[PDB]
Amino acid sequence: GPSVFIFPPNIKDVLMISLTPKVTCVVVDVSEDDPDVQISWFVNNVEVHTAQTQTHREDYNSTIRVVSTLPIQHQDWMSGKEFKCKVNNKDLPSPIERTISKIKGLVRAPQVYILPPPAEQLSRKDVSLTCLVVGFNPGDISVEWTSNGHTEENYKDTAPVLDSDGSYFIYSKLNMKTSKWEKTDSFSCNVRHEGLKNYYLKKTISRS
Amino acid sequence: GPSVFIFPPNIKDVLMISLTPKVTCVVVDVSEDDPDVQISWFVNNVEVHTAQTQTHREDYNSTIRVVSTLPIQHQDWMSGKEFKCKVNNKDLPSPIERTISKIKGLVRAPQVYILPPPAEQLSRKDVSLTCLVVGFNPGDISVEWTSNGHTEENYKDTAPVLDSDGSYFIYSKLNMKTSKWEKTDSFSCNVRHEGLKNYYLKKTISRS
Ligand SMILES: *[C@@H]1O[C@H](CO[C@@H]2O[C@@H](C)[C@@H](O)[C@@H](O)[C@@H]2O)[C@@H](O[C@@H]2O[C@H](CO)[C@@H](O[C@H]3O[C@H](CO[C@H]4O[C@H](CO)[C@@H](O)[C@H](O)[C@@H]4O[C@@H]4O[C@H](CO)[C@@H](O[C@@H]5O[C@H](CO)[C@H](O)[C@H](O)[C@H]5O)[C@H](O)[C@H]4NC(C)=O)[C@@H](O)[C@H](O[C@H]4O[C@H](CO)[C@@H](O)[C@H](O)[C@@H]4O[C@@H]4O[C@H](CO)[C@@H](O)[C@H](O)[C@H]4NC(C)=O)[C@@H]3O)[C@H](O)[C@H]2NC(C)=O)[C@H](O)[C@H]1NC(C)=O
Ligand SMILES: *[C@@H]1O[C@H](CO[C@@H]2O[C@@H](C)[C@@H](O)[C@@H](O)[C@@H]2O)[C@@H](O[C@@H]2O[C@H](CO)[C@@H](O[C@H]3O[C@H](CO[C@H]4O[C@H](CO)[C@@H](O)[C@H](O)[C@@H]4O[C@@H]4O[C@H](CO)[C@@H](O[C@@H]5O[C@H](CO)[C@H](O)[C@H](O)[C@H]5O)[C@H](O)[C@H]4NC(C)=O)[C@@H](O)[C@H](O[C@H]4O[C@H](CO)[C@@H](O)[C@H](O)[C@@H]4O[C@@H]4O[C@H](CO)[C@@H](O)[C@H](O)[C@H]4NC(C)=O)[C@@H]3O)[C@H](O)[C@H]2NC(C)=O)[C@H](O)[C@H]1NC(C)=O
């Protein structure tokens, strides 16, 4: 029959109070004859009624998926409360249950560094700024870029990578125009991580 | 029953004529009661008899794993010959075949940069040298470090990461004592890739 998977909120949504973190329950391979799925939600075994549930046609392989996202309180995630979805359908003998909560573990704040472009790039039209975020636990982190205050979108980062000392690091590569590098005052690597004071740390660099 | 997985040689073994690349077939979930397995190997459907096979007791879940590695010629892998293992066992109705060969893809040679430590890190007891390798296809690459000729093993790299332009990049971080950053004359990032001349490029950095 159908399978069910549960997912934690995005770490950025958890650490940014103006955003809405959500726990997600996904019912995969729902039968088309039988698309009625009831998904109910529990926070520490207390039922809640705020989840938004949608059916999606998966055109990759012509299947159906039902996705339920429960909006949650940030502090409830951080303080270790259990979120649980119960899925009922006809093709299911008994209801299938999934539970998730935040893993209580080692917390270690990252160091954040910005590396200027390599010298070899300074004669080209485009340069790469590198944000190196090092020594954090756990491995969940948001890393974004701005120039002065404006959001920069033309970056990619790596997976968090577990180092030999048991902590993680990540690289983020921002490509911008050498002219922009020359004219713009400042570029900022903005890091959200639970070990940081206020969950937030900005590092800024300028061309000299 | 059991299943069979086939794995390619490691890119470094492929690109260094002095090393021995191997195609590997792994049989998982062979029963403790029937650990015997028959395995044959074919290079372009000619049987070869050079494979090394070891059986492992997987005490974790009381199963058996058989790993067979065929040593292969570099040119045979690079030129796209088909490597095939056929596996039989009591608990398999008919023999399982797995095949593998090198994909004929785009080959794009990367640029290699070495970045010095970020300025804010030079106070510490250890500094990080960053090797940034940008714009390669396919995404198989070997990145290693030397100080002059001598191997420097205290490094971790990211996965290759697929960029915006459909090429890959990768970061490699070598951590070193700040004292060696000031004493040692040179550190080298050594990149082996299909698209590089002689499959090898060395980039070198010193403190200035
Ligand atoms: C038909 O096709 C569909 C679609 O297939 C996919 O899409 C196409 C286009 C191609 O890319 C396919 O190759 C794709 O696969 C098939 O559906 C898929 O079915 C799989 C089942 O066979 C199922 O498998 C794995 O799922 C998770 C990983 O899921 C994430 O990554 C997948 C990519 O690998 C994605 O497909 C998923 O979408 C999912 O991605 C995450 O999604 C969440 C929720 O949307 C999202 O979080 C939310 O994001 C919001 C913003 O977008 C916001 O932030 C919200 O607040 C937030 O909540 C994530 O951000 C997003 N991340 C990414 C990177 O995309 C695996 O975990 C799972 O493994 C577990 O189960 C197997 C057993 O089956 C075990 O072997 C395995 O070890 C795991 O077991 C678990 O182990 C841990 C620790 O070991 C334990 O703690 C757990 O208890 C234990 N759990 C269990 C249950 O055992 C699966 O391997 C895919 O999710 C699913 N995809 C979708 C989209 O539904 C379908 O199968 C096909 N049908 C047929 C008949 O063939
Ligand atoms: C009982 O337990 C065992 C052990 O379980 C593990 O250990 C315990 C303690 C726990 O930690 C568990 O969580 C662990 O799982 C279970 O065995 C496991 O069974 C899995 C299947 O049930 C099997 O699954 C995946 O295997 C490969 C990945 O394998 C590599 O990565 C793993 C994770 O890193 C490693 O652990 C593996 O050992 C393996 O590592 C690779 O090993 C090769 C071979 O040695 C090595 O290459 C050689 O290396 C040499 C140097 O040492 C030298 O360089 C040689 O030249 C070189 O050849 C590699 O270096 C190394 N690689 C890496 C990355 O580390 C997955 O690829 C595979 O995925 C496929 O299957 C599913 C479904 O088909 C798909 O989602 C997926 O896309 C793949 O499908 C493929 O898709 C393509 C197209 O996209 C098709 O063309 C393919 O044909 C298609 N394949 C098929 C078959 O259709 C599996 O998901 C685990 O490997 C295996 N673990 C071990 C250690 O054997 C067992 O299941 C349990 N039994 C139970 C519970 O009943």
Short mmCIF file of N, CA and C in Angstrom, two decimals, chain A residues 108 111-118 120-121 124 128-132 134 154 156-159 161-164 169 171-175 203-204, chain B residues 111-121 124 128-132 134 154-159 161-164 169 171-175 203:
data_model
loop_
_atom_site.label_atom_id
_atom_site.label_comp_id
_atom_site.label_asym_id
_atom_site.label_seq_id
_atom_site.Cartn_x
_atom_site.Cartn_y
_atom_site.Cartn_z
N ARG A 108 27.42 23.60 19.42
CA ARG A 108 28.70 24.27 19.26
C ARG A 108 28.55 25.34 18.20
N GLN A 111 32.55 29.18 13.85
CA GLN A 111 33.31 30.34 13.40
C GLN A 111 32.96 30.59 11.93
N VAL A 112 32.88 31.86 11.56
CA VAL A 112 32.49 32.27 10.22
C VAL A 112 33.60 33.13 9.63
N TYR A 113 34.09 32.75 8.44
CA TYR A 113 35.12 33.51 7.73
C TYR A 113 34.69 33.78 6.30
N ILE A 114 35.06 34.93 5.75
CA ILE A 114 34.87 35.20 4.32
C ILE A 114 36.24 35.27 3.65
N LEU A 115 36.39 34.52 2.55
CA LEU A 115 37.64 34.51 1.82
C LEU A 115 37.47 35.37 0.60
N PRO A 116 38.39 36.27 0.30
CA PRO A 116 38.27 37.07 -0.92
C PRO A 116 38.45 36.17 -2.13
N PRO A 117 38.21 36.67 -3.34
CA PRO A 117 38.45 35.84 -4.51
C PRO A 117 39.92 35.48 -4.63
N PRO A 118 40.23 34.32 -5.19
CA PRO A 118 41.62 34.04 -5.58
C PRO A 118 42.17 35.12 -6.53
N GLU A 120 44.02 34.98 -9.09
CA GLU A 120 43.85 34.64 -10.50
C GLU A 120 42.51 35.09 -11.08
N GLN A 121 41.49 35.29 -10.25
CA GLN A 121 40.18 35.66 -10.78
C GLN A 121 40.01 37.16 -10.96
N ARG A 124 39.34 38.62 -14.43
CA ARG A 124 38.21 38.13 -15.18
C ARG A 124 37.00 39.02 -14.92
N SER A 128 34.62 34.90 -7.29
CA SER A 128 33.93 34.06 -6.32
C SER A 128 34.32 34.49 -4.91
N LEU A 129 33.32 34.85 -4.11
CA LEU A 129 33.51 35.01 -2.67
C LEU A 129 33.19 33.70 -1.98
N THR A 130 34.01 33.33 -0.99
CA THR A 130 33.86 32.05 -0.29
C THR A 130 33.55 32.32 1.17
N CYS A 131 32.42 31.82 1.64
CA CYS A 131 32.11 31.82 3.07
C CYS A 131 32.45 30.46 3.67
N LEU A 132 33.39 30.44 4.60
CA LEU A 132 33.78 29.22 5.29
C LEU A 132 33.22 29.28 6.70
N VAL A 134 32.80 27.08 10.10
CA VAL A 134 33.55 25.94 10.61
C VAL A 134 33.27 25.65 12.09
N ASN A 154 23.04 34.47 -6.13
CA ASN A 154 23.85 33.68 -7.05
C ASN A 154 24.99 32.96 -6.31
N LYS A 156 26.03 28.96 -4.34
CA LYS A 156 25.80 27.57 -3.97
C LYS A 156 26.64 27.22 -2.75
N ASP A 157 26.15 26.31 -1.95
CA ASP A 157 26.94 25.82 -0.84
C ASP A 157 27.08 24.30 -0.94
N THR A 158 27.88 23.74 -0.05
CA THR A 158 28.13 22.32 0.00
C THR A 158 27.25 21.68 1.07
N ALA A 159 27.25 20.37 1.12
CA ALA A 159 26.63 19.78 2.31
C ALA A 159 27.45 20.21 3.53
N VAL A 161 29.74 19.17 6.20
CA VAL A 161 30.68 18.05 6.15
C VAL A 161 31.22 17.82 7.55
N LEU A 162 31.12 16.57 8.02
CA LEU A 162 31.61 16.21 9.34
C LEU A 162 33.14 16.14 9.32
N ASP A 163 33.78 16.93 10.17
CA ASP A 163 35.22 16.98 10.31
C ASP A 163 35.69 15.89 11.28
N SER A 164 37.01 15.71 11.33
CA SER A 164 37.58 14.66 12.16
C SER A 164 37.42 14.95 13.65
N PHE A 169 31.67 21.52 8.99
CA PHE A 169 31.96 22.76 8.28
C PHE A 169 31.18 22.79 6.97
N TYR A 171 31.11 25.17 3.07
CA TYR A 171 31.55 26.27 2.22
C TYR A 171 30.37 26.80 1.43
N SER A 172 30.28 28.12 1.29
CA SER A 172 29.31 28.77 0.42
C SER A 172 30.07 29.64 -0.57
N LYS A 173 29.75 29.50 -1.86
CA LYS A 173 30.45 30.18 -2.96
C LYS A 173 29.49 31.17 -3.59
N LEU A 174 29.78 32.47 -3.45
CA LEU A 174 28.98 33.52 -4.08
C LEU A 174 29.71 34.05 -5.31
N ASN A 175 29.12 33.89 -6.50
CA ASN A 175 29.70 34.46 -7.72
C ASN A 175 29.05 35.80 -8.01
N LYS A 203 29.20 38.13 8.98
CA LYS A 203 30.57 38.51 8.66
C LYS A 203 30.55 39.31 7.36
N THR A 204 31.36 40.36 7.31
CA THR A 204 31.37 41.27 6.17
C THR A 204 32.79 41.43 5.65
N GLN B 111 39.22 24.75 -13.40
CA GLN B 111 40.21 25.66 -12.84
C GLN B 111 40.48 25.30 -11.37
N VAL B 112 41.73 25.43 -10.95
CA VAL B 112 42.16 25.10 -9.59
C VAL B 112 42.73 26.35 -8.93
N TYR B 113 42.14 26.75 -7.79
CA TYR B 113 42.69 27.82 -6.97
C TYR B 113 43.04 27.30 -5.57
N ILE B 114 44.05 27.90 -4.95
CA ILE B 114 44.33 27.72 -3.53
C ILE B 114 44.10 29.05 -2.82
N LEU B 115 43.32 29.01 -1.76
CA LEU B 115 43.08 30.24 -1.04
C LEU B 115 43.88 30.22 0.26
N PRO B 116 44.54 31.32 0.64
CA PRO B 116 45.25 31.35 1.92
C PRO B 116 44.27 31.37 3.08
N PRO B 117 44.72 31.27 4.32
CA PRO B 117 43.77 31.31 5.42
C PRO B 117 43.09 32.66 5.46
N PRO B 118 41.83 32.71 5.87
CA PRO B 118 41.21 34.00 6.18
C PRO B 118 42.02 34.74 7.24
N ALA B 119 42.09 36.08 7.10
CA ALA B 119 42.94 36.88 7.98
C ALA B 119 42.61 36.65 9.46
N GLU B 120 41.31 36.62 9.79
CA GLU B 120 40.85 36.44 11.16
C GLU B 120 41.25 35.10 11.76
N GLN B 121 41.74 34.16 10.95
CA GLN B 121 42.13 32.85 11.46
C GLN B 121 43.62 32.78 11.78
N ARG B 124 45.09 31.92 15.32
CA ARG B 124 44.80 30.65 15.96
C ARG B 124 46.00 29.72 15.93
N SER B 128 43.48 27.08 7.99
CA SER B 128 42.87 26.28 6.94
C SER B 128 43.35 26.81 5.59
N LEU B 129 43.88 25.92 4.77
CA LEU B 129 44.12 26.21 3.36
C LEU B 129 42.94 25.65 2.57
N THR B 130 42.42 26.44 1.64
CA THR B 130 41.26 26.04 0.85
C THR B 130 41.68 25.82 -0.60
N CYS B 131 41.41 24.65 -1.11
CA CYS B 131 41.55 24.42 -2.53
C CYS B 131 40.17 24.41 -3.17
N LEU B 132 39.96 25.32 -4.12
CA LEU B 132 38.69 25.44 -4.83
C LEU B 132 38.87 24.98 -6.28
N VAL B 134 36.88 24.26 -9.79
CA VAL B 134 35.65 24.82 -10.35
C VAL B 134 35.50 24.43 -11.82
N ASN B 154 45.78 15.67 6.59
CA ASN B 154 44.82 16.32 7.49
C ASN B 154 43.84 17.21 6.71
N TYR B 155 43.11 16.63 5.76
CA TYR B 155 42.21 17.43 4.95
C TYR B 155 40.87 16.72 4.82
N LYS B 156 39.84 17.52 4.56
CA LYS B 156 38.54 17.00 4.17
C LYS B 156 37.99 17.85 3.05
N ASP B 157 37.37 17.21 2.08
CA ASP B 157 36.76 17.97 1.01
C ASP B 157 35.25 17.76 1.05
N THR B 158 34.55 18.56 0.27
CA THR B 158 33.11 18.46 0.18
C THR B 158 32.78 17.35 -0.82
N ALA B 159 31.51 17.09 -1.05
CA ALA B 159 31.22 16.37 -2.28
C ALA B 159 31.54 17.29 -3.47
N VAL B 161 29.94 19.46 -6.12
CA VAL B 161 28.63 20.11 -6.08
C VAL B 161 28.33 20.62 -7.48
N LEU B 162 27.15 20.28 -7.97
CA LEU B 162 26.71 20.69 -9.29
C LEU B 162 26.38 22.17 -9.29
N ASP B 163 27.10 22.94 -10.11
CA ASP B 163 26.94 24.39 -10.18
C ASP B 163 25.74 24.79 -11.05
N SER B 164 25.61 26.10 -11.27
CA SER B 164 24.51 26.65 -12.07
C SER B 164 24.65 26.30 -13.54
N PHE B 169 31.79 21.94 -8.95
CA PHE B 169 32.91 22.47 -8.20
C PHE B 169 33.09 21.67 -6.91
N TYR B 171 35.32 21.99 -2.90
CA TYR B 171 36.24 22.63 -1.96
C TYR B 171 36.97 21.56 -1.17
N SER B 172 38.25 21.78 -0.91
CA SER B 172 39.04 20.90 -0.07
C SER B 172 39.76 21.75 0.96
N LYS B 173 39.63 21.37 2.23
CA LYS B 173 40.18 22.13 3.35
C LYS B 173 41.29 21.33 4.01
N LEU B 174 42.48 21.88 4.03
CA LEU B 174 43.62 21.29 4.71
C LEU B 174 43.90 22.13 5.96
N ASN B 175 43.79 21.52 7.13
CA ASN B 175 44.09 22.21 8.39
C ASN B 175 45.55 22.01 8.77
N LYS B 203 48.65 22.95 -7.89
CA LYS B 203 48.65 24.37 -7.55
C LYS B 203 49.33 24.53 -6.20
#
